[PDB]
Amino acid sequence: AARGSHMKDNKKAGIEPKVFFPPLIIVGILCWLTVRDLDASNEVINAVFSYVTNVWGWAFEWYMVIMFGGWFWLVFGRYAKKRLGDEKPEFSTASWIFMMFASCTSAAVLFWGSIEIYYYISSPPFGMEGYSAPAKEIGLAYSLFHWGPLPWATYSFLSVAFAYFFFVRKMEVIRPSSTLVPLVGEKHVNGLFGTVVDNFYLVALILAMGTSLGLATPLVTECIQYLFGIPHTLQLDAIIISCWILLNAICVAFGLQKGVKIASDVRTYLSFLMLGWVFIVGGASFIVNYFTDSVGTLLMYMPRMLFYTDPIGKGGFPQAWTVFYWAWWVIYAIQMSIFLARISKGRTVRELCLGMVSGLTAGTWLIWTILGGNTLQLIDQNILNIPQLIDQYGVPRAIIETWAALPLSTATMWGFFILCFIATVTLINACSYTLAMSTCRSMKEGADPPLLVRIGWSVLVGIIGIILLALGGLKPIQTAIIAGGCPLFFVNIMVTLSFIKDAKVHWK
Amino acid sequence: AARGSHMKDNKKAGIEPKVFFPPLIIVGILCWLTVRDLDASNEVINAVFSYVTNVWGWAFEWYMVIMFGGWFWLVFGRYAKKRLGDEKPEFSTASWIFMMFASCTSAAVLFWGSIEIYYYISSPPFGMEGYSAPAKEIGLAYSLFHWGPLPWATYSFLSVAFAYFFFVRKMEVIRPSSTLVPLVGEKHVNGLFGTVVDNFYLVALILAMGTSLGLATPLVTECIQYLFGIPHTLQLDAIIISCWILLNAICVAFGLQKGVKIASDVRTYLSFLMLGWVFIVGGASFIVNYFTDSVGTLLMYMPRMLFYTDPIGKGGFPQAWTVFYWAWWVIYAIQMSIFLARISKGRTVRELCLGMVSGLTAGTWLIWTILGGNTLQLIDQNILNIPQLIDQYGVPRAIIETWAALPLSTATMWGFFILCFIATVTLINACSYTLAMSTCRSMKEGADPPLLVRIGWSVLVGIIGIILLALGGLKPIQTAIIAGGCPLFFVNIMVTLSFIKDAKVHWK
Amino acid sequence: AARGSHMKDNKKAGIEPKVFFPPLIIVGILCWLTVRDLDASNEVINAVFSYVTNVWGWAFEWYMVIMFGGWFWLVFGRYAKKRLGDEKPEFSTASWIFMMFASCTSAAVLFWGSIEIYYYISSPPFGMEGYSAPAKEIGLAYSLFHWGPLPWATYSFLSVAFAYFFFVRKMEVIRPSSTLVPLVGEKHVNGLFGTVVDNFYLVALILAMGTSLGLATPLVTECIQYLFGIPHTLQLDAIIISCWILLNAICVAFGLQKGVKIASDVRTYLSFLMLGWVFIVGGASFIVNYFTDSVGTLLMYMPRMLFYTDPIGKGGFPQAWTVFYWAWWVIYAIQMSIFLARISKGRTVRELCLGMVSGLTAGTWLIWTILGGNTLQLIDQNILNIPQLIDQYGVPRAIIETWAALPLSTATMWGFFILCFIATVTLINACSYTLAMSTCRSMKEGADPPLLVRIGWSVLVGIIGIILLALGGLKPIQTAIIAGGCPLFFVNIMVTLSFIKDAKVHWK
Numbered sequence A, B, C: 001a002a003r004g005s006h007m008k009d010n011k012k013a014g015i016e017p018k019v020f021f022p023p024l025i026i027v028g029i030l031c032w033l034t035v036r037d038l039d040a041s042n043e044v045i046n047a048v049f050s051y052v053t054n055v056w057g058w059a060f061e062w063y064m065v066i067m068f069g070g071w072f073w074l075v076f077g078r079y080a081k082k083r084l085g086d087e088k089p090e091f092s093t094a095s096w097i098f099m100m101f102a103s104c105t106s107a108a109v110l111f112w113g114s115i116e117i118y119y120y121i122s123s124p125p126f127g128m129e130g131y132s133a134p135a136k137e138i139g140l141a142y143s144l145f146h147w148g149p150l151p152w153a154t155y156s157f158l159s160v161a162f163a164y165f166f167f168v169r170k171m172e173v174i175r176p177s178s179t180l181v182p183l184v185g186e187k188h189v190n191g192l193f194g195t196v197v198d199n200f201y202l203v204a205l206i207l208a209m210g211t212s213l214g215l216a217t218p219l220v221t222e223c224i225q226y227l228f229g230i231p232h233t234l235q236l237d238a239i240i241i242s243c244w245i246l247l248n249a250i251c252v253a254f255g256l257q258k259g260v261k262i263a264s265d266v267r268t269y270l271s272f273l274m275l276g277w278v279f280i281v282g283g284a285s286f287i288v289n290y291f292t293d294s295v296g297t298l299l300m301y302m303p304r305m306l307f308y309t310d311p312i313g314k315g316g317f318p319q320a321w322t323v324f325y326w327a328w329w330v331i332y333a334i335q336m337s338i339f340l341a342r343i344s345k346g347r348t349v350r351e352l353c354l355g356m357v358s359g360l361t362a363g364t365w366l367i368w369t370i371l372g373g374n375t376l377q378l379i380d381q382n383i384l385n386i387p388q389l390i391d392q393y394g395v396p397r398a399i400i401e402t403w404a405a406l407p408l409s410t411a412t413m414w415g416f417f418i419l420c421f422i423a424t425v426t427l428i429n430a431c432s433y434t435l436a437m438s439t440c441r442s443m444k445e446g447a448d449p450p451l452l453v454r455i456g457w458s459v460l461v462g463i464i465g466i467i468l469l470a471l472g473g474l475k476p477i478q479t480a481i482i483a484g485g486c487p488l489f490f491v492n493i494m495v496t497l498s499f500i501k502d503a504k505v506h507w508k
């Protein structure tokens, strides 16, 4: 225990058993149990989904309401004009929006963007009849709601909190625990409380990352089946997941940050090209008209959508969608808010709140109205039988089918194939990075994490994906999200309370 | 006419014939006529209800709209930051809310809270079908509307006006007339104009107080019938009303202010216990879910509910409920606003407007969603046949039946019995006090009113209750409220105009 | 080319070939082609209507949304407190409102005010059933929308822009082109760009003026047929149009500005008398109740109405009405905004925005609810068969029939006859004035335009009316409006961008 041991900040690199082992053990144990009996796992998975959504769905809904309220408080309250770092923004306002407008590009987004409208239209909210005109007229509006300005505004409290911690308090924050000192004290932060918090967070994050794989993988393999004729099987999925891991491993080992960043740029520009293409050849005039109509419908129904539980009719719509999506929002809040904070030094509180909500919803509104308007038309015109395609082949095939129904079919599918593939590479890279940084001992800033830790995490995330795929269907992915959401409900609130308490003292 | 007669402020105690005799004569004459022929009275009662609501319902609706607008003007306008008395508030912000949150406890509230949803659900607005899902889905929302933030916000103009008169102008105000000097001048105030105004007010108030009895009494006697087996009759009602009068008389004569105040505290805490109990054992999960859903529905329909007259379909919904309840709101505005003003010295205008609307609706929202969600479930599950119970026994019995349907039935009914009983004691005490103070000569501050005047008024109010009960049903109570509302429509407006005019001069 | 030619501002009077000839040629050519084959013109007219509304209707809708947003920016933004001229307003606030509240009086307003509800009720939006209760309950609300605070608020940007140009920049502005210097530069303004802009504007205006005639004329002749027995024919219409032209010619030639102004005053006061009469004897109680109900319905549906395209059901409602009316709004924006600017010197930006929206909607709300509530009742009670009347005689006859159905039938029709007649005289006078001023060389301020130019334009406008009448029905009038609207979509936006750019520099 010597010598010269406590004569400075820690300054050495490696794993921190505090937070490295428990996640590994917990996710490992869960994977093993899931695989023991896939049919009984699915039975429990379904019971967990139904229980949380039906019994605690209301709390997820009130969380979004409160956070939405917070956005107004930030935009109009005492902090509106506070600068987040006295320096000038490190980006032009345009590159700043472009960076948000770019982070919207993802594989999960192409998944839900392409298919969620089919579900809204066939099993409508508010007791409407499946496939009726009124079901069709509310379909996109409900996307504009679940992926619009309201959900994005709920990230504002956390984004401002983190930019305040980074740039006014000048704290290095990696783990949630590090922001809670104003709230519970250093004893609790550094003790067991802060350890549990950080471990619950990491588990939720790990599961969430697996779900991203679980959704992105089948899209890529359906593209592969369509383009090359290689049949989509669970083995093809395990093969592609392996390639991503190896690719990641080669990128990390040889430190190709430069190349990965360029890939990130290509995915962003390909996204624009692909959406623009779908718009131009998918029925531009209908899409513009349908979007316009859906805005007014969204504005009218919004308060109804925000507080919807269907307690009389019990059709289950809010439970299946709103609660699940809100859990998705809650799971990714800290992660997304940190990234928004980082690109926002020098901006004012109100500037951050207005800009992020503007640029981010532009991104998501565009994706869901173009892909959703395409899908809706294909259903309307009987070009596809989506129910039949799903019952036979699975959801990912039905999605690929909405893409291949467009002109220049083979070229279009090349575009999408490339998009979903690079997106997943940059997602794996980013995922492995975050997990490594969060489970290793405090290391000098600007330094990359221990390589073997980083690769090891990518492998565990890949395992989770293949199991989710083995389990089959949407339900396992949805329940992993709902599960992770439950703890992070409390973690998110704790970080914002911590910010609010600190700000009383150091922001006046 | 001497001597030394006008060498100071009046400083002596007794009745003021200006305002003591006319009310007595008017209410006496009305009681006598009503009793002459109960069946013809009821016929006229019904015709007065239908006429005012159908022909002048729109004016009651626009009154609430304007007053609601005024709330925004107060919160965002030139007066927002004005303090109501330069002193520090005489209560902590918590005890201040608790005092509003406490004034919500009443017998009339348990009456309407328990039953109004049955009516909304069986004879729905907007042409919906009775007992349909959509009727059930709007039922609580319509309670959240009639007893929510909008009606409470309409008291803000009067509450601010009175706190301005009490604490900035330092005027002793008892009667409405005393605030009108800036508006019509001292001649009119002290002359016939101010006398008519104060007499119309007192008559409306007297009728309104009778209706409180008329509603509270049958609840207590249904509790008595349930608990002790004593059949509910008109004679049992006259007996209980007598006991309240005697109780009041003993409390006043021996000056037991201390004890009455403690009773007030018990009723407040019993209310919390009873509502909490109903919530915990009445279907907590359904109640939370139904409340959440109803908020969104309320937010969506609010503008429609605010301006509703049903002029095409003529189903009569707004006339039966909204207009009647708005008359109820209008009748009690001055009284409630004076009480809100008194507990608000030292608060700013905006503080008063935000706090009262927050604390008061918390109180009323809780009462109507718990009691209404209980009742709705009992109807849903066919535990009770409310229509049958009402046709056979009357509304009060159906209400008691929703309470007795809960676990620990006998204990629960003891809780409610005690609640409605003490509530009525403190209501009678407060009622008799106000009437005495308003009909007697200006007396030195902090002094209790002439005892025989005070008891005499409690007796006249008791008479009005027993007649209302003799008349039977809801209609007589509703028409007395609508009748009183008509004059006070103009009185309320006069006080706020008076405040607005004065404030131009003395508040800048 | 001499001498002393460029030693001052131009200072001489006559036509400016830049902008005098092209309009004349273009409208002349169009008139001639239209008349060549009335049945084929109507076929093309119908195809132009369907194409613009269906394909580009969305752009008209987003234009109103953006302009509406601008109103909030003006009321709450950096310019809210800027004064439009440092002088004191040249009118009392009352005479200022009265002047807006007066400009609402017109023949076109009596036309649409009287009949549009019949169309809303018989061919309802949102897939409702014709003549159903819900169709009737939304009917007036849709008038309150198309002629309410939202459309009036969209004039605020242009009204503020022109008052800024007139009173802060002290520029003489007659033609749109003259405001674009900050936007495109003097070269473009004085060159071809500014010439095209001003010519497109003048053509749109000329067509629009013809439509006013095309609507006002048949109302007057139906009144003439009703009162005097003279059969309504195309020849009677050509005769009345001639009388207006001659009347105008006599008024202009002998410079009877005084008398025309008095006529303007009479029309204003007659309007009040006629509306007040219709209200008092047309079912006051129903009208008050129906208006109240319609406000709440309007507030609830507004966001839905604002963004409505009906892309699924394709019932065509928004295309037939909203898009057409928005084109009407767009066509008259510059003209109306100049007039609002002129009567608003010395007012602040926010004052102009609040006052104009308040006074103007008071005017239009009153007209459409009184005339629309009258018409609705006549349909409800089966006093008239409007469809039958229209198929047989045309729309103008059905309108006159709603007026003649009121008590004192002969006197009422005298009132309306006089109203529509003087209204059209003052409209022709104002129209001819504007066209003259816009097509003639810059002349010294306060000077009347060349008389023969002024009369000549009134004649061309009269021709356009008679052709529109020869074409028959509503469609030609609607398509001329939609046609003119398309160019002025861009002209309106250009003036506001020009104002915004200039204001950055000279308003701080």
Ligand SMILES: OC[C@H]1O[C@H](O[C@H]2[C@H](O)[C@@H](O)[C@H](OCCCCCC3CCCCC3)O[C@@H]2CO)[C@H](O)[C@@H](O)[C@@H]1O
Binding pocket: A068, A069, A070, A072, A073, A076, A077, A078, A079
């Ligand atoms: O004096 C103490 C401080 O209080 C203020 O807080 C206000 C802010 O000034 C004010 O902008 C803010 O308004 C937003 C309140 C929350 C509204 C939530 C709803 C917004 C609209 C509909 C969705 C929900 O309300 C806060 C209090 O409720 C501000 O924080 C400071 O300006 C002020 O100094």
Ligand SMILES: OC[C@H]1O[C@H](O[C@H]2[C@H](O)[C@@H](O)[C@H](OCCCCCC3CCCCC3)O[C@@H]2CO)[C@H](O)[C@@H](O)[C@@H]1O
Binding pocket: B068, B069, B070, B072, B073, B076, B077, B078, B079
């Ligand atoms: O200059 C004169 C004074 O005017 C102001 O009054 C404004 C206030 O500043 C401003 O806050 C207030 O806004 C509320 C207007 C009423 C809105 C009613 C609607 C509110 C929202 C929807 C329900 C109805 O409007 C008033 C005028 O309409 C304020 O009284 C002062 O700040 C100011 O000095």
Ligand SMILES: OC[C@H]1O[C@H](O[C@H]2[C@H](O)[C@@H](O)[C@H](OCCCCCC3CCCCC3)O[C@@H]2CO)[C@H](O)[C@@H](O)[C@@H]1O
Binding pocket: C068, C069, C070, C072, C073, C076, C077, C078, C079
């Ligand atoms: O610092 C730069 C300037 O920015 C401000 O602009 C604000 C204004 O202060 C602010 O009042 C204004 O609010 C209105 C924004 C547009 C809202 C449109 C919606 C309004 C409600 C629903 C219909 C549409 O937003 C502007 C920016 O979006 C103001 O122009 C100045 O006060 C300020 O100095």
